[PDB]
Amino acid sequence: RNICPIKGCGKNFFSHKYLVQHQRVHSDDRPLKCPWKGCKMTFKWAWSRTEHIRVHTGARPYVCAEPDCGQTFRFVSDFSRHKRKTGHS
DNA sequence: TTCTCTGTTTTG
DNA sequence: CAAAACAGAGAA
Ligand SMILES: [Zn+2]
Ligand SMILES: [Zn+2]
Ligand SMILES: [Zn+2]
Protein backbone atom coordinates (compact mmCIF):
# COMPACT_ATOMS: atom_id res chain seq x y z
CA ARG A 1 0.00 0.00 0.00
CA ASN A 2 2.23 2.54 -1.73
CA ILE A 3 5.47 2.88 0.12
CA CYS A 4 8.10 5.24 -1.12
CA PRO A 5 11.35 3.41 -1.57
CA ILE A 6 13.63 6.41 -1.44
CA LYS A 7 16.29 6.26 1.34
CA GLY A 8 15.12 8.07 4.51
CA CYS A 9 11.53 8.75 3.26
CA GLY A 10 9.56 5.48 3.47
CA LYS A 11 6.27 7.34 3.58
CA ASN A 12 3.16 5.34 2.61
CA PHE A 13 0.39 6.92 0.52
CA PHE A 14 -3.28 6.59 -0.05
CA SER A 15 -2.74 5.71 -3.71
CA HIS A 16 -0.16 4.53 -6.20
CA LYS A 17 -0.76 7.48 -8.49
CA TYR A 18 0.20 9.93 -5.62
CA LEU A 19 3.22 7.80 -4.81
CA VAL A 20 4.46 8.61 -8.30
CA GLN A 21 3.62 12.39 -8.10
CA HIS A 22 5.31 12.43 -4.67
CA GLN A 23 8.62 11.55 -6.30
CA ARG A 24 8.96 15.18 -7.42
CA VAL A 25 9.81 15.96 -3.81
CA HIS A 26 12.97 13.80 -4.22
CA SER A 27 14.14 15.68 -7.42
CA ASP A 28 15.45 19.33 -7.78
CA ASP A 29 13.42 20.16 -10.83
CA ARG A 30 11.05 23.07 -10.32
CA PRO A 31 8.95 22.89 -13.47
CA LEU A 32 6.39 25.67 -12.64
CA LYS A 33 7.15 29.33 -13.02
CA CYS A 34 5.61 32.38 -11.46
CA PRO A 35 3.84 34.38 -14.13
CA TRP A 36 4.59 37.78 -12.59
CA LYS A 37 7.00 39.74 -14.63
CA GLY A 38 10.50 39.68 -13.21
CA CYS A 39 9.81 37.14 -10.47
CA LYS A 40 12.19 34.19 -10.40
CA MET A 41 10.23 31.95 -8.07
CA THR A 42 9.60 28.42 -9.33
CA PHE A 43 7.58 25.61 -7.89
CA LYS A 44 6.97 21.95 -7.86
CA TRP A 45 3.32 22.11 -6.89
CA ALA A 46 0.53 23.98 -8.69
CA TRP A 47 -1.16 25.01 -5.38
CA SER A 48 2.10 26.53 -4.24
CA ARG A 49 2.16 28.75 -7.38
CA THR A 50 -1.46 29.70 -6.83
CA GLU A 51 -0.97 30.91 -3.26
CA HIS A 52 2.26 32.60 -4.23
CA ILE A 53 0.65 34.77 -6.86
CA ARG A 54 -1.36 36.39 -4.07
CA VAL A 55 1.85 37.81 -2.67
CA HIS A 56 2.11 39.92 -5.87
CA THR A 57 -1.55 40.82 -6.19
CA GLY A 58 -2.22 41.56 -2.54
CA ALA A 59 -5.48 39.62 -2.66
CA ARG A 60 -7.18 38.21 0.43
CA PRO A 61 -9.69 35.84 -1.10
CA TYR A 62 -10.60 33.90 2.06
CA VAL A 63 -13.48 35.83 3.68
CA CYS A 64 -14.92 34.47 7.00
CA ALA A 65 -18.69 34.19 6.68
CA GLU A 66 -19.45 34.02 10.47
CA PRO A 67 -21.93 36.81 11.28
CA ASP A 68 -19.92 39.98 12.24
CA CYS A 69 -16.40 38.28 12.07
CA GLY A 70 -15.38 40.19 8.99
CA GLN A 71 -11.88 38.76 8.90
CA THR A 72 -10.09 38.02 5.67
CA PHE A 73 -6.98 35.94 4.82
CA ARG A 74 -4.44 35.71 2.00
CA PHE A 75 -3.53 32.05 2.52
CA VAL A 76 -5.66 29.01 2.90
CA SER A 77 -3.80 27.63 5.88
CA ASP A 78 -4.37 30.88 7.80
CA PHE A 79 -8.12 30.75 7.08
CA SER A 80 -8.15 27.10 8.22
CA ARG A 81 -6.37 28.18 11.39
CA HIS A 82 -8.96 30.85 12.09
CA LYS A 83 -11.78 28.33 11.57
CA ARG A 84 -10.16 25.83 13.88
CA LYS A 85 -9.52 28.40 16.62
CA THR A 86 -12.80 30.21 16.51
CA GLY A 87 -15.34 27.55 15.27
CA HIS A 88 -16.37 29.96 12.42
CA SER A 89 -17.98 28.01 9.47
C1' DT B 1 3.85 36.89 11.37
C1' DT B 2 4.06 35.56 6.27
C1' DC B 3 4.29 32.29 3.25
C1' DT B 4 5.64 27.56 0.97
C1' DC B 5 4.76 22.84 1.07
C1' DT B 6 2.41 18.49 0.53
C1' DG B 7 -0.74 14.49 1.75
C1' DT B 8 -5.46 14.12 1.32
C1' DT B 9 -10.12 15.80 0.14
C1' DT B 10 -13.30 18.13 -2.91
C1' DT B 11 -14.88 19.62 -7.36
C1' DG B 12 -16.18 19.29 -12.09
C1' DC C 1 -10.72 10.10 -13.39
C1' DA C 2 -7.64 14.81 -13.26
C1' DA C 3 -7.47 19.34 -11.43
C1' DA C 4 -8.30 22.36 -7.89
C1' DA C 5 -8.52 23.18 -3.35
C1' DC C 6 -8.06 22.31 1.56
C1' DA C 7 -5.80 21.63 6.22
C1' DG C 8 -2.22 21.33 8.86
C1' DA C 9 2.66 21.60 9.45
C1' DG C 10 6.34 24.38 9.97
C1' DA C 11 10.57 27.20 7.64
C1' DA C 12 12.07 31.80 7.76
ZN1 LIG D 1 9.44 9.74 -0.86
ZN1 LIG E 1 6.26 35.53 -8.15
ZN1 LIG F 1 -14.31 34.31 11.58
Numbering used by the authors: 1265 to 1353
Sentences from the paper on this structure:
The RELATIVE OF EARLY FLOWERING 6 protein (REF6/JMJ12), a Jumonji C (JmjC) domain—containing histone demethylase, specifically demethylates H3K27me3 at its target loci. REF6 has intrinsic DNA-binding ability and specifically recognizes its target sequence (CTCTGYTY motif, Y = T or C) via tandem zinc-finger (ZnF) domains located at its C-terminus. ZnF domains adopt the canonical ββα fold, with a small β-sheet packed against a helix in a globular structure, and wrap more than one turn of the DNA double helix, interacting with DNA in the major groove with a classic α-helix. Structural analysis demonstrates that CHG methylation is unfavorable for REF6 binding and attenuates REF6-binding affinity.
Although the overall structures of the REF6 ZnF domains were similar between complexes with methylated or unmethylated DNA oligos, there are minor conformational changes when DNA strands carrying the methyl-group. Further analysis by isothermal titration calorimetry (ITC) between REF6-ZnFs and the DNA probes with or without 5mCs revealed that 5mCs lead to great reduction in the binding affinity to the CTCTGYTY motif. In combination with EMSA assay, the biochemical and structural studies demonstrated that DNA methylation at the CTCTGYTY-motif, especially at the CTG core, is sufficient to abolish (or severely attenuate) the affinity of REF6-ZnF for this DNA sequence.
